[PDB]
Amino acid sequence: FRNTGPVHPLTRQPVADRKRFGGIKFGEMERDCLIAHGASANLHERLFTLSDSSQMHICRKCKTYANGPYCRVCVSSDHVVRVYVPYGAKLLCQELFSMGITLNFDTKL
Amino acid sequence: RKTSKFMTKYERARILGTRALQISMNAPVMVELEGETDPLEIAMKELRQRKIPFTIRRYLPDGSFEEWGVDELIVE
Amino acid sequence: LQVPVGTLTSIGFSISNNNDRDKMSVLEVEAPNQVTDSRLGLPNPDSVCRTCGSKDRKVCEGHFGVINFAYSIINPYFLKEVAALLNKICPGCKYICRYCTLNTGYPLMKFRVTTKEVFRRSGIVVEVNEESLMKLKKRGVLTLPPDYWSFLPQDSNIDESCLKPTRRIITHAQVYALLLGIDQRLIKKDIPMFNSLGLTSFPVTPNGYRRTRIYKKLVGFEGNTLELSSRVMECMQYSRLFSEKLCGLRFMKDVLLGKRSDHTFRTVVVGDPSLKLNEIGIPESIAKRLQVSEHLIFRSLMDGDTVLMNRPPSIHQHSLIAMTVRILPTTSVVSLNPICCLPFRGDFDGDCLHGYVPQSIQAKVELDELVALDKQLINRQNGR
Amino acid sequence: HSIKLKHTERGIVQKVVLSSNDEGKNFAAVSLRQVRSPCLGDKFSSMHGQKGVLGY
Amino acid sequence: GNADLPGTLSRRLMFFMRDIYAAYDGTVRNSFGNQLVQFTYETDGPVEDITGEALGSLSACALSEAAYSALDQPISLLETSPLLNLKNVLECGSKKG
Amino acid sequence: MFIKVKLPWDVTIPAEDMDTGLMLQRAIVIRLLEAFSKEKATKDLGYLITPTILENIGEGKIKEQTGEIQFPVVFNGICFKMFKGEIVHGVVHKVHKTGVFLKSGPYEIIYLSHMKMPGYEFIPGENPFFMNQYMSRIQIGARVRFVVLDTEWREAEKDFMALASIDGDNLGPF
Amino acid sequence: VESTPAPFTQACFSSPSQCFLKAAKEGVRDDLQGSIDALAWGKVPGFGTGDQFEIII
Amino acid sequence: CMMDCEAFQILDGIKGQLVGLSEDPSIKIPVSYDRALAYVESCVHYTNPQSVRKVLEPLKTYGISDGEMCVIANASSESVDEVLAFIPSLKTKKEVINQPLQDALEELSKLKK
DNA sequence: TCTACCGATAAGCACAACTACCTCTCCT
RNA sequence: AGGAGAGGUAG
DNA sequence: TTGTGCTTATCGGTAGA
Ligand SMILES: [Mg+2]
Ligand SMILES: [Zn+2]
Ligand SMILES: [Zn+2]
Ligand SMILES: [Zn+2]
């Protein structure tokens, strides 16, 4: 059983060790079954809320990723929006940038 | 228009969840409930009494949407 | 400060160029011994971040740094696009000439990319068709003309190869020399991303992410550029997305597809006919430690709460059943009605059922309205 | 430094053994004993392949 | 052996049928580009009140249940297993040669 | 440049008070008052005091966290832009050896440098320093007109600091 | 054939590196129309819950 | 457009509204009200109808931009040598004779008794 | 009478060969 | 703290 | 090792100018 515990160094997910308050893997089959049932709030909570939760800052003017937030590609702008995406998405973006692929994000708000 | 005019299970569940979340945050209840200590019970009572001030916007796949209300729709 | 919130949509894909690579990197020094700098990531041996504030690897993101190259390097991803274009366009006519007419004695050339076959370098090596060579051999021509390779400008990056007079490794400087004079319309038609042609920089992984030795060896670059291109190609293949355990599709499954959540319990299940079908027995020893989120901040599990029970693997959608928590004096075990074993397709011989406790109120409201036992009385497979 | 017991580690100290090899590295062994009474979740097996857990 | 076949088949069928959902107009549409899969649901009654249900997910789950609840015994040297027949039937584009 | 320009907002209303449909407009204006009161600052726009005219309201969007609902409302209000080449008045608060203070309202702080006024010697024979070398006495409370220059801003406070120059005519009080 | 680009779903199916490289070379635009794409980026699928919206007035 | 006159008239409205139902269940901010009382007491006009109409008459009869009206009205120069030395936009221009400007100066002098 | 792309065959070159969990023992 | 080699449990 | 997809590479091929 687990309520709160340490996270993995690579991804911000509960450790698999049982003695260290490990969590239960939410597999693909369970996600498919929950989609078939039609419950999205439970699926959203299990994949984003109780799972690795992080934040990413995207510049409104230029479609780039900015690290308050500040984008060096453009000038210091006061229009920067924050999106709520899992830490796995940020890890994938970092991996894509390392391999030589740049992603552009067009926020709707 | 061009709708079934029936409240689906998913929409009903979402409305009940939203109303329960609102009530759990110390919100006044439009309907009068006696001996009720659970927000879900009050939400279900309001749904049965169709006094919820909610409107449903159904997004059609073509891009358009139709505005409905919980009082206009019926619950099976 | 404070920034507005918004949704994410319309993800675009493009190949990184030098401009975005330089703009994204912050404090990108070119020191060989400063790979693990104090300005990139927290896990550096100083515990202080220059760009961000002090944190516990929870409020600081992984900063990026990009090294610089003395000479221009062609992009390996566009290597095939350039190799195919050089085969069609004549190397000394720049049209769609000695290299065009067959009566001049000059055989045709084939442009291709080798893969760790000759010098362990993924570059452009032009080859002459051997069928035409035999035709020249039968006419009395044994060796190639001395002025055959006059279209290649002199390059100082060339080194001692001595492979064969018929094959030559094209220098990266020669690639730009051959591309000059060609109309931009033809180049843009084959290569959509013209701005990413020149690769004058290469980024390094943040300290908070993880190849490091190769990146350190790339700080000092001089002489031939083919070795640098080979090093870049070898370093790009160390990414987790490339196939070789946590790499490739397994990385995707273990990061984005499959995740682990909190507020989960896993215990062995036994039979209890006295309990109702829609009720699940929860031991008192575990219920007092499992905490739920109720708005008045955590309270222990009690009777009336709903949990999502699942048996791995989930072969059908009826494995997910929401049951009400019923506290029992038994410990280190969960009690389930023997009738409810059919939806779970399990028996009482060592099967373990792991549940999920919903924390949000809306999740609980939707759990017993759609995933409850009374809602799943009709089988969706056969209608029985 | 010191080694602490984990969440599911418990018992009563039975014996402490101290030993060292020829290289000079010291080894310490501590044994913990506990009684395992048949609980509800325990699984029992027969001599003919019958497998089951304790129901009640 | 043969334990991986039902899982792989179920995953590959889910990846195809996950996007299928029923629209408010009564048609069956895919999530990618609102592609029309079926103009009208071909059920033989008796209630047409299903609007937001994921029909493709239900069908794929039913087929996965059928695959898992099936034997792997080769019936004969010539005949195939009841799961092998399902695997061959579900894969039509692979047997083009 | 006191042009009353429109300014949309996305003020959110908590679920603590959602009732009285016949008097729902009372709750909307109260939430609007707390919207600009929390910020009470701007970067390049200026200041706003009261929502005099309400143009229109929007549909209530519900976001599922802590019971919060949003309301898009567009309205016009009072604004002030410090354009370059404007003669404005101000009152003096204190006199120091460096950075003479000028208070053109408590909305901003104005500092007077050395290279703004005519050359003079600081009079240390009295309590407050005087600038009567050019036949003009300046004290606290007297209104003095001056030209404005390019204003600056901060990161957290974002105060609209500027420089006061008396290089123009009609210097001193009137 | 349907002229619908889904690079993320194709990468999640098999060979993510080749799919991502091809998408970057072609410069396609992912609209996150799929359910798995929305789930991976913290968005509701929209099949049962999320297809409609709620408005107070 | 509120420079001196109509800005003061609406400030009396919020002060007349403050005395009615002064209690507030929310948290008020006191620096917003201090910016209104400590800045409107610089220059005050007498009447709204004849003051806002007279200042807009030269906008129709003469050619003056929007930004030029605000600086001149707030400065309120008392002569003709100050208008040609404050703003650099009026240097080397012959679109308007100075005598009509002097008549407008007298016209602005009679509004303020 | 000498060239163009065009049908079938060899030869590398890739991905893929199930979920959900538990221990121990060895490096690095 | 992190990875590789074996054995084991459930459908 | 296999089991299929997948991209180079060679043998001849007939048709039209
Ligand atoms: Mg069993
Ligand atoms: Zn920017
Ligand atoms: Zn940092
Ligand atoms: Zn040519």
For residue C84, which nucleotide's C1' is closest to its Cα? K8
- Please name the method used to determine this structure: cryo-EM
* Identity of residue F15: A
Residues 6+ away with beta carbon under 8 Å from C123: C79, C113, C114, C169, C170, C226, C229, C230
Q: How far is CA A86 from CA A48, C305, F123, in A?
A: 6, 28, 67
Query: How far, in Å, CA of E29 to CA of B9, rounded?
Result: 20
Q: How far is C88 from chain A (nearest CA, A)?
A: 28
Taking the C-alpha atoms of residue C172 and residue H66, their distance in angstroms, rounded to an integer, is 61
* Backbone phi, psi, residue A57, to 5°: -105, 130
What residues form DSSP beta bridges with C15?
Answer: A101
Burial class (CB in 10 A: 0-12, 13-18, 19+), C157: middle
Rounded-to-integer distance, Cα A91 and Cα A109, Å: 23
Cβ–Cβ contact G42 with F under 8 A: no
Helix axes C172-179, C79-88, angle to 10 degrees: 50
Amino acid, single-letter form, for residue F63:
K
Q: Which two tokens stand for residue C281?
A: 């027995």
d(CA C253, CA A28): 8
For chain A, state the CA radius of gyration: 17
CA proximity to E17, closest of C314, A35, C380, B63: A35
Mind spelling out the 3-state secondary structure of chain A?
CECCCCECCCCCCECCCCCCCCCEEECHHHHHHHHHHCCHHHHHHHHHHCCCCCCEEEECCCCCECCCCCCCCCCCCCCEEEECCCHHHHHHHHHHHHHCEEEECCCCC
Best of B14, B47, B76 to disrupt the C interface by mutation (most C CBs within 10 Å)?
A: B14
**Given in angstroms, what resolution was this structure solved at?**
3.4
Is A33 within any annotated ligand binding site? Answer: no
CB C191 within 8 A of CB C15: no
**CA dist C381 → E6, E60, F77, H72 (Å):** 17, 10, 62, 83
Look up the protein residue whose alpha carbon has the minimum distance to the C1' of I16: G14
- Breaks (C–N over 2.5 Å) after residues, chain A: 67
* Residue numbers after which chain H breaks, C to N beyond 2.5 angstroms: none
Q: Which residues, including other chains, have CB under 8 Å from residue B10's CB and lie 6 or more apart? A: A38, C370, E52, G48, G49, G51
The alpha-helical segments, DSSP class H, found in chain G are: 7-13, 16-26, 35-40
Nearest-angstrom CA–CA distance, G37 and G51: 16
Structure token digits, residue H40: 């409107």
- How many residues does this entry show for chain C? 384
The radius of gyration of chain G's CA atoms, rounded to the nearest angstrom, is: 14
Say if residues C37 and C65 touch (Cβ distance below 8 Å): yes
Q: Neighbouring chains of D at 3+ CB pairs within 8 Å?
A: A, C
Q: For residue A45, give the DSSP letter.
A: I
In terms of DSSP H, where are the helices of C180-280? 184-190, 212-217, 225-236, 249-252
Q: Nearest nucleotide, C1' to the C-alpha of E1?
A: I18
Pairing of strands C306-310, C321-328: antiparallel
From CA D1, how far away is CA B16, in angstroms rounded? 55
Give me the residues of C, 253-272, that contact D with CB < 8 A. 267-268, 270-272
Helix, strand, or coil (residue H86) = helix
Q: What gap in Å lies between CA H10 and CA H2, rounded to an integer?
A: 10
Phi, psi of F119 (to 5 degrees): -60, 135
Contact status, residue A52 vs residue A87, Cβ threshold 8 Å: yes
Residues of B in contact with G49 (CB under 8 A): 10, 13-14
Decide: helix, strand or coil at residue H81.
coil
d(CA F13, CA F27): 9
Greatest CA separation found in chain G?
Answer: 48
Pairing of strands E20-22, E28-30: antiparallel
Task: Give the closest residue to F58 by CA, choosing from F90, F85, F32.
Answer: F32
Q: With touching defined as 3+ CB pairs under 8 A, do chains A and G touch?
A: yes
DSSP H stretches of helix in chain F:
24-39
Q: How far apart are CA H60 and CA H109, in angstroms?
A: 21
Rounded-to-integer distance, Cα H106 and Cα H101, Å: 9
DSSP C303: T
- Say which residue the tokens 């290597």 belong to: C79
Q: Determine the distance separating the centroid of ligand 4 and the alpha carbon of C369, expressed in angstroms.
A: 74
Cα(C356)–Cα(C261) distance, integer angstroms: 9
Rounded to an integer, what distance in angstroms lies between the CA atom of residue C174 and that of residue C157?
Answer: 10
β-strand partners of A14: A7
Half-sphere exposure at residue C1, Cβ-oriented, CA atoms within 13 angstroms: 14
| Residue the block writes with tokens 């799972």 | A51
Say how far residue E7 (Cα) sits from the centre of its chain: 13
A9 and chain G: CB distance < 8 Å anywhere? no
Here the tokens at position H94 are 């012959």
Q: How far apart are CA B47 and CA C104, in angstroms?
A: 91
Whole-angstrom Cα distance, residue C261 to residue C308?
13
* Alpha-carbon span B48 to B35, nearest angstrom: 17
* A 69-98 → G contacts, CB under 8 A: 84-86, 88-89, 96
Q: Measured between alpha carbons, how far is G37 from G43 in angstroms, rounded to an integer?
A: 8
- Nearest CB among G49, G52, G57 relative to B56 is that of G52
Residue H6, Cβ density class (10 Å: 0-12 exposed, 13-18 middle, ≥19 buried): middle
Distance in angstroms: CA H47, C1' J10: 91
CA distance F12 to chain B (A): 14
Which two structure tokens, joined as six digits, stand for C43? Answer: 């896990």
> Phi, psi (5° rounding) for residue C321?
-130, 130
The one-letter amino acid code at C186 reads L
Backbone torsion region of residue F28, taken as left when φ is above 0, otherwise alpha when ψ lies between -120 and 50, otherwise beta: alpha
Backbone angles phi, psi at F24, to 5 degrees: -70, -25
Q: Find the radius of gyration of the CA atoms of chain H.
A: 18
Residue with tokens 């009563």: D12
Strand partners, F14: F68
- Check if G9 contacts E (Cβ < 8 Å): yes
Distance from residue C128 (CA) to nucleotide K14 (C1'), in Å? 28
| C112 CB neighbours strand K below 7 A | yes
Listed residue (F13, B49, G54, C22) closest to H26, CA to CA: F13
State whether residue C77 is helix, strand or coil.
Answer: helix
C214 contacts in chain A (CB < 8 Å): none
Distance of CA F152 to CAs A49, C342, F43, F109, F160, Å?
A: 42, 73, 9, 11, 6
In angstroms, the CA D28 to CA D21 distance is 12
A38 interface with B at CB cutoff 8 Å: yes
Residue F44, number of CB atoms within 10 A of its CB: 11
Who's near D48: CB < 8 A, 6+ residues apart?
none
Dihedrals φ, ψ of A24, to 5°?
-105, 125
Cα separation values, H38 from F83, H8, H73, Å: 21, 12, 20
- D5 Cβ partners below 8 Å, 6+ apart? none
Quick one: how far is CA E28 from the chain centroid?
15
* C-alpha distance from residue F151 to each of F93, F111, F164, F165 (Å): 20, 11, 10, 13
Which residues, 6 or more positions from H41, have their beta carbon under 8 angstroms from its beta carbon? none
What are the residue ranges of helices labelled H in chain E?
4-17, 55-68, 82-90
Distance CA H28, CA F36 (A): 11
The Cα–Cα gap between G47 and C242 comes to 33
Nearest to D53 by CA among C268, G57, C334: C268
**Terminal CA-CA length for chain A:** 39
